[PDB]
Design a protein around this ligand. Structure first.
Ligand SMILES: [Zn+2]
Ligand SMILES: [Zn+2]
Length: 157
């Protein structure tokens, strides 16, 4: 399941640290590095277009003040994945620019169905924060199986 067409797509999600999603692009790039000529030319526009709107937006904004690793770190944890900074920034942006209603309408095109808690079934929670042995068992290393009670995270995540 966790090896779909998304691996060919590898587009960065707004919560995803740039280099982390680029990491799995790099794992494909290291393999299919036959046409290096097209690959390198692609990666130039590809990785920047691969970013979430906000991410490529900041890249070009802080580019002058961010050499290379700096701009990479800038897009690592955009406003912090679990930080409240991003959540308030989303509200600050919302009142400031009317472009937020446009992307709000565009949100209808986006499958925002990730909110539904992948263990409880409903979107009352978020699976990222909801730690509850409801069903399925081990979602960590087995997904389809393994005892969730004996699944201690060691050299995995
Ligand atoms: Zn839940
Ligand atoms: Zn497990």
């Amino acid at each position: 399941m966790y090896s779909p067409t998304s691996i060919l797509d590898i587009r960065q999600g707004p919560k995803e640290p740039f280099r982390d999603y680029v990491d799995r692009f790099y794992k494909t790039l290291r393999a299919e590095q036959a046409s290096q000529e097209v690959k390198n030319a692609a990666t130039e526009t590809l990785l920047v277009q691969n970013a979430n709107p906000d991410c490529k937006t900041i890249l070009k904004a802080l580019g002058p003040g961010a050499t290379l690793e700096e701009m990479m770190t800038a897009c690592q944890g955009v406003g912090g994945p679990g930080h409240k900074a991003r959540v308030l920034a989303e509200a600050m942006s919302q009142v400031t620019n009317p472009a937020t209603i446009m992307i709000q309408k565009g949100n209808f095109r986006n499958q925002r169905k990730t909110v539904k808690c992948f263990n409880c079934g409903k979107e009352g929670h978020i699976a990222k924060n909801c730690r509850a042995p409801r069903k399925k068992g081990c979602w960590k290393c087995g997904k389809e199986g393994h005892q969730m009670k004996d699944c201690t995270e060691r050299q995995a995540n």
